[PDB]
């Protein structure tokens, strides 16, 4: 199984530096291009950089040339993107991907070319002056004033945090059906807020336990809150 894993993302001040890592397994880098493509939140895919570790060639998108350097280390089978002089416009999810390279433009290997066939999962880079702030987690209680037949709604309000992301799970991932976790909104305070809600049978309220597990890795904070009928 071919695999690419990003790490290094995070929150960095304008003009700062961050180095991303793309750990490859299941294949050797020497045989292919390793690419970095980025997606600013709400924006399209932008190719950014590429490297062939066999040949040592590198190329960059203009938006990036001069400030980013892609490199690779054949020993750890890993590719890196050194970013310097970061601006607010570099805030994005950074994916890495592979593709079969060709020395001749407009030609592809009949057996080995498959475009960008494997991707990583992405790492978020946020360029900002705001400090890290962990979230406040409040219950969205189902009460007897939430009595809506045989289907009740309860949830967790995840308020005033920075930077993205938080993940919410319910009962340590055991409760998955009926869960909705809303995209965060940027508030006027400069901090993010979101809610996660789940719908659940009303006859299970006084008897089944519901706990939201909010993780905020950027601040190394986890919050487990039991949501109780009030």
């Amino acid at each position: 199984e071919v695999q690419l894993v990003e790490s290094g993302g995070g929150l960095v001040q304008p003009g700062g530096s961050l180095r991303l890592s793309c750990a490859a397994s299941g294949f050797t880098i020497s045989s292919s291009y390793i690419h970095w493509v980025r997606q600013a939140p709400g924006k399209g895919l932008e190719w950014v950089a590429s490297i062939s570790s066999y040949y040592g060639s590198t190329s960059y998108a203009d938006s990036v040339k001069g400030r980013f350097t892609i490199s690779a280390d054949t020993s750890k089978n890993t590719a890196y993107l050194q970013m310097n002089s970061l601006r607010a416009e570099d805030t994005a999810v950074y994916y890495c991907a592979r593709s079969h390279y060709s020395v001749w433009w407009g030609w592809h290997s009949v057996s080995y070319y498959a475009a960008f066939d494997y991707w990583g999962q992405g790492t978020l880079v946020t360029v900002s002056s705001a400090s890290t702030k962990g979230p406040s987690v409040f219950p969205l209680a189902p009460s007897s004033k939430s009595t809506s037949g045989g289907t009740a709604a309860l949830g967790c309000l995840v308020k005033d945090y920075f930077p993205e992301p938080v993940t919410v799970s319910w009962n340590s991932g055991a409760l998955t059906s009926g869960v909705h976790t809303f995209p965060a909104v940027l508030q006027s305070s400069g901090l993010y807020s979101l809610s996660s809600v789940v719908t659940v049978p009303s006859s299970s309220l006084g008897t089944q336990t519901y706990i939201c597990n909010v993780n905020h890795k950027p601040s190394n904070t986890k919050v487990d809150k039991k949501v109780e009928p009030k």
Binding site: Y54, V103, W104, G106, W107, H108, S109, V110, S111, Y113
Partner: peptide
């Protein structure tokens, strides 16, 4: 050696290449 394909023209064109120069 590897069989290359070039589909720039409506005709699929072919070549063989090798570049293990490193």
């Amino acid at each position: 050696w590897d069989l290359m394909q070039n589909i720039m023209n409506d005709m699929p064109i072919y070549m063989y290449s090798v570049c293990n120069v490193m």
